[PDB]
Symmetry: D5
């Protein structure tokens, strides 16, 4: 990512909207924004293999594992405005379990991109499926979207839930149900 | 609508109920009431096609999407008093997903009319079924009614829930149950 | 109701328990008590037909309608002490829906009598059944009883739940479960 | 109040906003609206003396009495839209105390009119002052305004607090503070 | 208390309100009602010295003791309907402290009578003052009144707070303030 | 604001960060972002006189008026990332009161700019002071900043409170205290 | 119960633990302790028929009756330390319903003994079964155990749930489930 | 403590209340009870010097240190029944601070005895004073008493607050207020 | 455990991280750390048979027993950082029930080791199975992991749920569901 | 720091406590522990000047700025066990305001060391006083300590509050009080 190009773009952005790029508090803005967006889009430049590291251990049992409340922050591809909340993950191992924090690293890998919540849940679930090959994976993403809060419809109480169910989580309704019950 | 006729009716309404349209605080009231009512009934003059704004994107998955807590305000056709609360929407796509904000715009289109809560839920669900042609749609409307609170029976703790299920949400019981669970 | 007789009975009631009907704070008590009981037992003198006063409209859909949290106050026939709480009503129409507030008026008609909570739920459900002839009706009553709280066992944390299920609410387990779930 | 004239105005209102007065659901609306508004403005036709009903008793002590959480409903004189919430009353008697329910009756007398929240608090406080001539009285009104929620700015989380302090509540900082502390 | 006369009065009461004194469920009601009222007015027949049972001990220190949340139930002398809630007591000893449970026994002594909340607070405070002769005592009574909820104004959200401050609690602003702060 | 120039800038922004501006979901992004920023910076192009309209009425009393919970959304001038929360306003009128919703319009006027929370509170307070010239104004802004949540320090539980006190709110500590107490 | 022997045993107990049986504060302790234990074990000396007092009435309907939140206090037979919480009771009548307060009297009968929570649940259920011979009865006991909190493992956050299901509650999965759902 | 004697006393206690020391569930009870009481009265046998075990460090500053929510369990000397809750401690050092956990060890030293809540607060405060000789100490104890809950008055919502203020906490009203505020 | 060797390792640890072992505050740290770790790993040195202490009793019934909220503390074997939360246990006896506190003792035996949450749940369930040979047992562990909060991903809102189901808890869907429902 | 030496010490630590460094799950533990501790003590190697990053801007007003809820994690120098919670910062500028995020960076700089909570508060406050030279600064640290929860006294409900007041926050009592009020 060319930071110099972003700085120039952000500098021109400031004047077009009616601001003074030469103003005290805005002098370092173009630079700050460039770095911000480099970090906010770093997910595209990450590799699932490096993200997971070697944190794949032998299964201690065959029971469901649920990692809930993994906060996430993303940017809607439609308005380039933040949407955020939490990701809840559930899975039944076949023979391998993942290091808990790796779930969070996977979430960040896909969240730090321009997204749509429906895709985020699917990519997270697919990544986990690919790394562990468990009996099944379930991913629930719940977030608030600033694009419909600070503009447009300006709704305030709304929240969106998207999900992705693979393997036994898609097959056995009782399994999916038990996973969703743990979230309430 | 004819604002001049509304203003004249409102000015007379003030007189009949025992008020003084000449009062300082009531001088601009007939005008404010006319504009307010034009806004509160604007839903009758909206077109579903324009409300959607072509914000129909290709489905990212087959899993249920739930847009909950969309606050709404409406007027009961029986007393012309407000009833409000929230609208919860759940659906399973069939190659098409809607822009999140459009759900809120569809809600406002039907809420900004004289209504009955049972109808509001059906119309919202049918509008979503027409725009997107998903496997199913589920709409739950929960509201409090001022015509039951500030007059008549004067009940204070009551709340009404109405709904509409289409496609798999009406067919598949486990699907409906899963949608409802997400609301608790 | 003979307000004059209730007034004389109340005056003597004051004397027998060791009070003085002649003291300033009790002067108007026999009259106040008389009027209070006339109101508290008014349910016996009401007619369902008049309570509903029409307000029966054609159904807008086939989905369940849930009117929850209708507060109620009644008197136990055993001790003549208040028991109160909330009444939750659910029904699937068969071509006819009821005006929301009429549910409250029906609740009051039966609550404003000497009661047994188990009976109250059944009578409310049966009244709804007669008026709408819906596919099914479900009524849940939840209340605290002063005869259990301010005397006798003097338990403080207890509350009682009673209900009545008719039509499809009795026959269809899933319909009943869906109704009860909307209450949690 | 001329109910016949209100019904006529309401019927024309339905036509002007774009609705059909002939609709089955709107046939009885003009009558319902007329009756509703007569009730919603009955406060103008009430008399403080009749509202109190001589329920003024000898003081039992010289300590503060606080009647909190008296729910109220009113109509803003600016838009004729409902604003509602609760009224909290505090006072220190000077030989005379008021029947608790009379505070509620006084609240309703001034609430069932076209109002501005600032005035509602003042009139309630002055009414109490006139009736009891206490050492002091304080009134706090907290309400949500639909004209700010259903339209205009459409803000959702806002609430307004207005108050009126008389006698010792205005003159004694500690007294007022003690009263406000009771409300938290 | 003449239970026989109460039973006769209650049996006639059932007749006057329109009920059937002979039906199975009301056969034992006059008897249950008589006993209930004997219990509810037992406070008139109790004496402070027997209630305290000599449970007065030497002060362990000089700081205030606060006994809060003592639930109480009483009957308003105006309507003979229950009012209930909690009593909070605070006092600074003057060489003597009271057995904690005796505060509850004192509350019941004055609550189990026909009362006015303002008086209940004062009497509890004076009973404590007499038994311990402390540097000061403060009593706060908070309750809901059924005569305001199940009839009349029918307000649902209101609660009334009354109090009585003696000695240092009345004269020392900071002492009273510290006491009230413990209740929040 | 030149929307065409923003569209071109946003288009180049998309490719520099590593995205495909020709991708289905990003085709209309440059346009959507342009409109978004025009709206998000519209505050600079508003006039306080037009915002307030003519909503200045005579004072109903001299007591404090508190408008709390006015939600707001803004953009930090440092990172061009959203920060949001609520604004609480309190004032003691000298002779004029403001229309409640105008407080919200003033908040939006200054919030829809590139800001720093410290300045936002001051500008809001100054605007109100200028329009009403009351005895004093108090403004409290509380918000969460995405720039320290979704990046940088990545703190999650943090909230920032900034304020501005003018007139009696700056002078009398007791007044400022009473205002802040209403907020808790 | 031989109170004299209890007093002697308690006086010796005070001596053995190292206290002074002669000090002012312990002089009446043996007496207080003896009386307390007579009360705490009074359940052994009670009989189901007298506890019920013939308060058995004809069934008003066929739906389940749930009496929840009946607080109870008992003593574990293992350490003679208190365990307490709440008992929830549910049953489907077979022509007979029980006076609500009798459920509480039955709970106390079995609680005021040396117990094991598992047994307490079973005995309450069996007592109800015997008195009403209902289609089924379910009892859930939830409590905290001081022998686990103030000594031994000293865990602070634990609570134990025990239950007993008879008739249809044991055999009908959905009936048991509906009962447990009412408790949540 | 003579465990053997307590064991013999406990065995006879079981017999006199109507139980059977020989039944399976009571076989090891006399032994369990003996050991429990040895632990519950261990506070008498501890020494402050050893409880603190050094752990006194030089002060890092002059500001108040508040250790709140230290759970405690004790036994009333009046009924030998548990009373428990929390102890909150506050102090301003004078060159010396205490190891956080030592506050808990001191609490237990005094709680594990036969007590009076008023005394417990004073003894804890005095122990802190002797160990640190701070500028001031403040101890607040809040607890529920089983002798008031499971017998006697049987009140359920009550809790008692007792305290001890030494040095600047007694002398400086603002310091005391600041301490108490940190507790809310 | 060689405490002397641990102290030596801890002293060198202080030097290597950059601290001064000679500091007044760190002089006793090696000793404190040594003792702490001996306690934190005491679970390896415990025996299930001694932990249970023969506290196995004859079953009082055949219904489920649920011991919930047993707080636990452990150390992740991966980073040697604490992870903690609560353990919930459910089981249906087959003639034998366990002393409630023994569940807590079993939890601690396995928690006070280096662990992975998935294993902790399994070992607890197997331990119970071995001791009681019940119809089934279910264990749910919910914990927060400092290695995910203090470092690494630094996620703040996340919590992990692991479980183990044996016998009827694994084989009977309804049984497991009933157990999980009790936890909500 | 020397990671190789930390790894060697950690590998030996595993052996001494009774573990097997050869275990699959412990193979990479010494390495993970070394890196973790390097990160957890990185605060010793940070420079305040670099932490601020020159993010000191001109003051927008003279009103108090409060940055609350900054979560923090630290290690106690006494047991090398984590203690964590939140840090609340309040200050009144003197021509200079700090970038919000820098407060969080200052917190981490001092938290990521071996600490005592009393010191942490002072160092944070002194760092802010040096960077910005405001009229005053106030810092409140609230945390839970694992060395008190997972070992030793094993108290579960305790929390410790420490603070540091500089300038007007130490001088002006009303200023300190206002800052503390904002935290409640
Ligand atoms: N099902 C349904 N009923 C409604 C809605 N809004 C609304 O006012 N109603 C009901 O319409 C009915 C009209 O009753 P009515 O013709 O006797 O008029 P009324 O004003 O005397 O009724 P009320 O005093 O009981 O409120 C009321 O029972 C009212 O509750 C709604 O959205 N759905
Ligand atoms: N201050 C005070 N007033 C009380 C108490 N209990 C109680 O009923 N009152 C009041 O006594 C008054 C009696 O009024 P009233 O003689 O006009 O009788 P009413 O039944 O027509 O009054 P209502 O319908 O407004 O309740 C009521 O305002 C009632 O609220 C109490 O504890 N304290
Ligand atoms: N102080 C006060 N103002 C009120 C009350 N009710 C009420 O509508 N107002 C205000 O009256 C003003 C009328 O403003 P306006 O004459 O420009 O009419 P408008 O409909 O365009 O206002 P809006 O769109 O901002 O709500 C609004 O700002 C409204 O918030 C009330 O109780 N107290
Ligand atoms: N199932 C069940 N167990 C109980 C109840 N009350 C009660 O004390 N217990 C258990 O009875 C057991 C007696 O154990 P034990 O004979 O080894 O005595 P102890 O005092 O040394 O046990 P502890 O220190 O673990 O509490 C404890 O595990 C205790 O938790 C109860 O109501 N139900
Ligand atoms: N399944 C499971 N994983 C655990 C537990 N405790 C624990 O640290 N882990 C995981 O063990 C893994 C070790 O990963 P790693 O060898 O790459 O080391 P790391 O320190 O770089 O990991 P990190 O920075 O992502 O936390 C982490 O992903 C961590 O979340 C536990 O109880 N269960
Ligand atoms: N004031 C203060 N004391 C602390 C902090 N962290 C910390 O461990 N301490 C205390 O340092 C003291 C060290 O006590 P000690 O030398 O007798 O060691 P110990 O492990 O046997 O103590 P313990 O078992 O009571 O926890 C403990 O009382 C502990 O609570 C802190 O941040 N501030
Ligand atoms: Zn968007
Ligand atoms: Zn209506
Ligand atoms: Zn009864
Ligand atoms: Zn308005
Ligand atoms: Zn009354
Ligand atoms: Zn920023
Ligand atoms: Zn026990
Ligand atoms: Zn006692
Ligand atoms: Zn770890
Ligand atoms: Zn420590």
């Amino acid at each position: 990512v060319d930071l110099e190009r972003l700085q120039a773009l952000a500098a021109e952005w400031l004047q077009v909207i009616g601001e003074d790029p030469g103003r005290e508090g805005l002098l370092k803005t173009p630079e700050r924004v460039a770095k911000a967006w480099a970090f906010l889009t770093r997910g595209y430049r990450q590799r699932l293999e490096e993200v997971v590291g070697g944190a794949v251990f032998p299964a201690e049992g065959s029971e469901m594992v649920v990692v809930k409340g993994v906060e996430f922050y993303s940017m809607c591809e439609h308005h380039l405005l933040p949407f955020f909340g939490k990701v809840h993950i559930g899975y039944i191992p076949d023979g391998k379990i993942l290091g808990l924090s790796k779930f969070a690293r996977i979430v960040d890998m896909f969240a730090r991109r321009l997204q749509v919540q429906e895709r985020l849940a699917v990519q997270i679930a697919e990544a986990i499926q690919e790394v562990l090959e468990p009996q099944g994976v379930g991913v629930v993403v719940e977030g608030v979207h600033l694009c419909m809060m600070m503009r447009g419809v300006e709704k305030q109480h709304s929240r969106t839930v998207t999900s992705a169910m693979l393997g036994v989580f898609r097959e056995n309704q009782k399994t999916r149900e038990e996973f969703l019950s743990h979230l309430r």
